[PDB]
Symmetry: C2
């Protein structure tokens, strides 16, 4: 429902997903914005999706909602059940995706990250925080971790990056753009709104831009084991990448199904790693 979704469908159909994302990013500049963390139009209160054993000092997991226009509060439901009786799991909304008209978009990424940081610190109290994100969410998890450290004096205890494709490793994203766009339509529980598509464009552009800082927190890189689509071997490795991770785990599934069908394997890798970094 809306012209942007119709255009997006056609762009994917015509194998021009990348080009269409640029248009979304450009158009998003004309959406009403918030320029300061306080001026955020949404309540960014994290939702507690799983509870750890009743039995202090233990790290809590914070799921950083990704940029997908078809996303929202359902994103971490399958994964989070695997944390029940193991770790608290808080899901934090991404500013710009809410309804109430529609949500204001952040003027810049740091503004959104500051809004999230304030909500997370409030909710987590004294517990160490481990940030977790998938795809776009993984890139956002790292960016938030750096902002927490540099602007809030509160570096996370760890970052879990599930299938990140950072700016230096974009070939699989380019080669699989059609499959990525199709995965977005396939994942719709309802038609992606024009407002949420514009949000997705705005964040994609944010995450392409100059982001100098590197978080001091240790990284768990979780990688899909199956290619999302056809890939010519001489291009190199299609797998997700992070520079200098603390630990690398491989799990079953592709970019999408690793979370859709194999979320227990992702949780298992996280739980093993958390135990290893804590004691």
């Amino acid at each position: 429902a809306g012209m942007f979704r119709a255009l997006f469908r056609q762009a994917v159909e015509d194998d021009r997903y990348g080009e269409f994302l640029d248009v979304l990013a450009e158009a998003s500049a004309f959406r009403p914005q918030f320029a300061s963390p306080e001026a955020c139009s949404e309540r960014l209160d994290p939702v507690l999706l799983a509870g750890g054993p009743t039995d202090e000092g233990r790290a809590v997991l914070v799921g950083c909602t990704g940029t997908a226009a078809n996303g929202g509060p359902h994103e971490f439901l399958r994964l989070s059940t695997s944390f029940q009786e193991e770790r608290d799991f808080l899901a934090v909304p991404l500013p710009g995706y809410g309804t109430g008209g529609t949500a204001l978009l952040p003027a810049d990424l740091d503004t959104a990250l500051d809004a999230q940081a304030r909500a997370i610190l409030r909710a987590a109290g004294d517990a160490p925080v481990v940030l977790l994100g998938h795809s776009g969410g993984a890139l956002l998890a790292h960016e938030l971790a750096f902002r927490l450290e540099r602007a809030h004096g509160a570096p996370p205890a760890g970052i879990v990056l599930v299938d990140p494709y950072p700016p230096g490793h974009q070939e699989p994203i380019e080669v699989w753009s059609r499959q990525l766009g199709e995965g977005l339509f396939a994942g719709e529980l309802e038609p992606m709104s024009d407002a949420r598509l514009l949000a997705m464009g705005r964040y994609a552009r944010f995450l392409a831009g100059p982001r100098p800082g590197r978080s001091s927190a240790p990284v768990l890189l979780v990688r899909a084991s199956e290619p999302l689509g056809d890939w010519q071997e001489e291009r190199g490795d299609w797998r997700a990448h992070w520079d200098l991770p603390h630990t690398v785990a491989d799990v079953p599934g592709d970019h999408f199904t690793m979370m859709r069908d194999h979320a227990p394997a992702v949780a298992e890798a996280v739980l093993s790693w958390l135990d290893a970094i804590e004691g």
Copy 2:
């Protein structure tokens, strides 16, 4: 109504009309298109808005609809009343504004569709094309295509306040007023489909074009500036190279047609007598 209209309204508020027009052009790439004149999804039969005397080889006027997303059927109504009893006046639709109409793949495809419709409506009568603003640029482009590709140069072209490439600084400086004019001129909410059409044509008209029509030109110029302009900046007026005749009429870019259409009609009528 739609998200594009909402965004455009904000763009105009922020004085970024030009940037938004570029967004619309880029987005129009992802609308279904027609790639051959035959494949045009709409009937472009011109509409007769004014009737000349019964009384002959007298030229008929063909109004070339402009790109405004708020425009369409009403564009030439006020003007056309002044041709009643003087000249046949036909309005030709612009392809892509008509389930919504397929957009032309390129300008020549749209021009060919319009040419065909005009030639069958006009019969043996000579044709004088008339357009305002973007429509004036379109009138000239159609005239060239008629001559090049249809063996049928028009008898004349009337260009009402044209701002062609190389001479667009004033209309660019005044882009906020253009955008405000579109919202002020609304009879219904500008559809997202028509906004995309408007962007696509704006982009067509900024691109390199094949040549100049040999048809004589009447240049009709507004006498009052649409916005602020420093004297030392030079002439803000509409421009065409070496027109056959120039007429200056009261009003600005908009009001020359809004509340001085009789003056435009009078200039045209005088000119048609002279060239005939």
